[PDB]
Amino acid sequence: MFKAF
Amino acid sequence: MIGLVGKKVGMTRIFTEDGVSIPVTVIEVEANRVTQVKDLANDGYRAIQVTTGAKKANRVTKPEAGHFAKAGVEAGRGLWEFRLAEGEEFTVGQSISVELFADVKKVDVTGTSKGKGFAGTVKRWNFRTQDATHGNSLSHRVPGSIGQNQTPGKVFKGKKMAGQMGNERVTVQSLDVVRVDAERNLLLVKGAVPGATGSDLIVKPAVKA
Amino acid sequence: MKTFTAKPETVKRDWYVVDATGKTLGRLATELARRLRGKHKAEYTPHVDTGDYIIVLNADKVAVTGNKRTDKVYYHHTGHIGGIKQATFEEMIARRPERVIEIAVKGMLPKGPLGRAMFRKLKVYAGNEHNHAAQQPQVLDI
Amino acid sequence: SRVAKAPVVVPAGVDVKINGQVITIKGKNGELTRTLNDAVEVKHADNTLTFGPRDGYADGWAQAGTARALLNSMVIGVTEGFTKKLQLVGVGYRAAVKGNVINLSLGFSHPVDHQLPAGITAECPTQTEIVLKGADKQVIGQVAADLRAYRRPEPYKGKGVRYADEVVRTKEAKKK
Amino acid sequence: MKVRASVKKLCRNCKIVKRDGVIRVICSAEPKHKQRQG
RNA sequence: GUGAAGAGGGAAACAACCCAGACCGCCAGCUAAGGUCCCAAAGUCAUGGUUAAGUGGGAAACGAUGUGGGAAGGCCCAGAC
RNA sequence: GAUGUCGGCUCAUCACAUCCUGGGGCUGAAGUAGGUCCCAAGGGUAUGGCUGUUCGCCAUUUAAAGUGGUACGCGAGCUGG
RNA sequence: GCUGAAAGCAUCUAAGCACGAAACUUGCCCCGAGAUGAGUUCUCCCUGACCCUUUAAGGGUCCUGAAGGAACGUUGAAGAC
Numbered sequence A: 001m002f003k004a005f
Numbered sequence B: 001m002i003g004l005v006g007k008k009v010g011m012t013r014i015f016t017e018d019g020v021s022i023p024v025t026v027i028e029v030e031a032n033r034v035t036q037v038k039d040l041a042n043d044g045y046r047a048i049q050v051t052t053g054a055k056k057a058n059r060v061t062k063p064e065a066g067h068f069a070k071a072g073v074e075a076g077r078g079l080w081e082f083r084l085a086e087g088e089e090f091t092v093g094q095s096i097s098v099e100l101f102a103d104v105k106k107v108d109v110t111g112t113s114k115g116k117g118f119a120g121t122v123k124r125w126n127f128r129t130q131d132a133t134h135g136n137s138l139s140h141r142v143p144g145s146i147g148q149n150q151t152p153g154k155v156f157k158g159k160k161m162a163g164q165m166g167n168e169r170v171t172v173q174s175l176d177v178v179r180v181d182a183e184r185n186l187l188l189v190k191g192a193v194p195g196a197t198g199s200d201l202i203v204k205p206a207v208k209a
Numbered sequence C: 001m002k003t004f005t006a007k008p009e010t011v012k013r014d015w016y017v018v019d020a021t022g023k024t025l026g027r028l029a030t031e032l033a034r035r036l037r038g039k040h041k042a043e044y045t046p047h048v049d050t051g052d053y054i055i056v057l058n059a060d061k062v063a064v065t066g067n068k069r070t071d072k073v074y075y076h077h078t079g080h081i082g083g084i085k086q087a088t089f090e091e092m093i094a095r096r097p098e099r100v101i102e103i104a105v106k107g108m109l110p111k112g113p114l115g116r117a118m119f120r121k122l123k124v125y126a127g128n129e130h131n132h133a134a135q136q137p138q139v140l141d142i
Numbered sequence D: 001s002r003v004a005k006a007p008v009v010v011p012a013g014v015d016v017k018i019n020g021q022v023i024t025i026k027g028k029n030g031e032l033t034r035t036l037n038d039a040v041e042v043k044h045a046d047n048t049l050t051f052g053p054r055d056g057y058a059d060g061w062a063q064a065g066t067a068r069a070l071l072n073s074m075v076i077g078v079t080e081g082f083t084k085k086l087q088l089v090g091v092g093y094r095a096a097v098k099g100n101v102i103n104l105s106l107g108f109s110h111p112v113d114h115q116l117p118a119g120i121t122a123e124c125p126t127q128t129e130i131v132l133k134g135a136d137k138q139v140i141g142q143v144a145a146d147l148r149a150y151r152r153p154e155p156y157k158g159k160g161v162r163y164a165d166e167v168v169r170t171k172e173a174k175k176k
Numbered sequence E: 001m002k003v004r005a006s007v008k009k010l011c012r013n014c015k016i017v018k019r020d021g022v023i024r025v026i027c028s029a030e031p032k033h034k035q036r037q038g
Numbered sequence F: 001g002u003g004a005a006g007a008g009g010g011a012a013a014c015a016a017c018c019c020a021g022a023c024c025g026c027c028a029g030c031u032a033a034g035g036u037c038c039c040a041a042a043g044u045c046a047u048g049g050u051u052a053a054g055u056g057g058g059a060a061a062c063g064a065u066g067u068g069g070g071a072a073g074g075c076c077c078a079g080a081c
Numbered sequence G: 001g002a003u004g005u006c007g008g009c010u011c012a013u014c015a016c017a018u019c020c021u022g023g024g025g026c027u028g029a030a031g032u033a034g035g036u037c038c039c040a041a042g043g044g045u046a047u048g049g050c051u052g053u054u055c056g057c058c059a060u061u062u063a064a065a066g067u068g069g070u071a072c073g074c075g076a077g078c079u080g081g
Numbered sequence H: 001g002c003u004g005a006a007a008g009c010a011u012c013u014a015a016g017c018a019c020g021a022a023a024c025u026u027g028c029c030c031c032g033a034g035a036u037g038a039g040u041u042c043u044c045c046c047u048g049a050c051c052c053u054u055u056a057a058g059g060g061u062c063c064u065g066a067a068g069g070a071a072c073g074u075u076g077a078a079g080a081c
């Protein structure tokens, strides 16, 4: 699970 | 110009009075017998089919035996064809020896290269290997990226990938004729040629001139 | 009652020979396509090939109006990236003259299995003689 | 179409034949022939060749004048061979004639050999000048251009192959 | 030769000619004046 | 005004544009927009012209003895250009 | 009711507004070497120091170390500064 | 560039000719007749009885089993199989 803040 | 079919005996070194060492491939070119002649009126092109060597008559098939009997020739290892120039002419059953190259300085040698089997991209296409350390995970010599995302959305034809290597027809051009020895049916050509020892070999005068 | 429909194994087919010398490419092609599809027959059926066999002679002697004898470019892709190829009308005539007639007629025939079957009846020759004398084709003045 | 209107005279010693569009001219200096186009009409009903536009062709008038001009020179060629004179300018520029071949030295590292057309003849009165004689105006002019093309006259010194009547505009080199 | 959209005579000797569908100027008085439309 | 809540034909494909409002059935006819050489139903239709650029089937200022038509003017068989 | 970032690595592919090589016109082009413009995309089109950097500067090379598109190409291929 | 009118001159162009680049088509190397448009050439093999009706590129029994292939075995500088 990647994140894009 | 017409060529002949020989066998790769191996590799050998030739010394010279001046002190130079010439690496030469020893090619055995026995008597090449003409089994059939191709004529424009009947075949649409001018060429000669020749056979070399001999094979056990037990394993010769009936259709193969009948063809050789037509030209009055003994069955050889196989059959090869050479295209004829304007002035060249031959007759069925004629024997051609290695003396044809007596006046030839450069030759073209073709044969089946050594079979490497299934080869990876690094060996097959000289792909650069990725880092062996610095965090690399199971990707030390994998091909890597093979495309450009959505726009093409596919892999282009001819992309270099792992697959069969070698075991294919290969030609080496402009090999010097070091020596022609008719008394032993031998032809010494500088440098290496495709294929392993004992493999079928085709020698032609250098088309590149 | 039921409207008549042509039956593929009952169609009667006859052979024709057409001299392409001096005929414009496009206007000759339309007639060939019309004959190949069978639109000239009163028994025309869209789903049945009711056309005739046409032999084209002197395929290298077809004329093109205007300057398109050199500006007419034929494009085809080899399937490999960057494999776009060009060949002007003059080059096509020099290399394979019967391609121009076949390409023009092919683009005017229907598309699909039936259309390809229609094209198989077209037989184009670059020279003035053909080997289909056994079919005793009738001269067609297109 | 003033040129087209002017007729072309064929004096004694010149034989002309018209077979459809191809018109042939014969004379003492040789033989010439060309194929005229359909848009031009030529007649030989008298001692002079008359030209006019064929009906239905838009370019008849303009192209008719061209036919008259070529045949006027065509008749002149068979009666008097056209002559072209070239001059060689250079420190060591020389020319030689071996017959149908001309040998020139123009400062190159290799010899220059030119093959004349079958209908052209060349003479070299001086090593620095070559004179060409021929029957058809087209080839002789083309041959002269080919020889001139080997080394065109340099703007700064005028050296090279030039026509005898050519004028070369010499330009002075940038000072300092 | 200078290629530009505006091709015009530059002196009394310049002449405008059409060769292959291109308007170009040829001057026998000065090579600088020769132009082509492009 | 249409779509939304609207199918059908046309614009190659293309809710909103053009024509036109589908109760059901027919292997009948006439038309709209748009079209009539072939893919592909209908004119390789009849007259008088224009274009040579495949313009038509993308783009300006500006540039050019391209070519057609129209009304005037200077010069000219006292010899013009 | 998810289309994972910058840079590097690997592997690329196309455009031509061309960096080198090739062919030309002018030049205030003597030659050598350049300037500018036109045609040309076939091939080729650096390694290092610093910085996570692209970039940039610097060192030393090269015939040249081109400019761009491809999810500012490429993490179900690697890396994670 | 040659010749050359339209436009008496001039003009590489409108008719007609010549030259011109690593681009283009060939030349060199490899695959290639599933090229269903399935091509060409040279050899080799098979020269028996009958029976039935839905009597036609028909089905079936008996005799026959060719050229050649495959399988199996010993294996290869051929190969994942």
Ligand SMILES: [Mg+2]
Pocket (backbone or CB within 6 Å): B137
């Ligand atoms: Mg892990």
Ligand SMILES: [Mg+2]
Pocket (backbone or CB within 6 Å): B136, B137, B138, B139, B140
């Ligand atoms: Mg590892």
Ligand SMILES: [Mg+2]
Pocket (backbone or CB within 6 Å): none
């Ligand atoms: Mg990805």
Ligand SMILES: [Mg+2]
Pocket (backbone or CB within 6 Å): none
């Ligand atoms: Mg797609």
Ligand SMILES: [Mg+2]
Pocket (backbone or CB within 6 Å): none
């Ligand atoms: Mg709603």
Ligand SMILES: [Mg+2]
Pocket (backbone or CB within 6 Å): none
């Ligand atoms: Mg989702």
Ligand SMILES: [Mg+2]
Pocket (backbone or CB within 6 Å): none
């Ligand atoms: Mg090439």
Ligand SMILES: [Mg+2]
Pocket (backbone or CB within 6 Å): none
């Ligand atoms: Mg750097």
Ligand SMILES: [Mg+2]
Pocket (backbone or CB within 6 Å): none
């Ligand atoms: Mg990206």
Ligand SMILES: [Mg+2]
Pocket (backbone or CB within 6 Å): none
């Ligand atoms: Mg971090």
Ligand SMILES: [Zn+2]
Pocket (backbone or CB within 6 Å): E010, E011, E012, E013, E014, E027, E028, E029, E030, E033
């Ligand atoms: Zn000027």
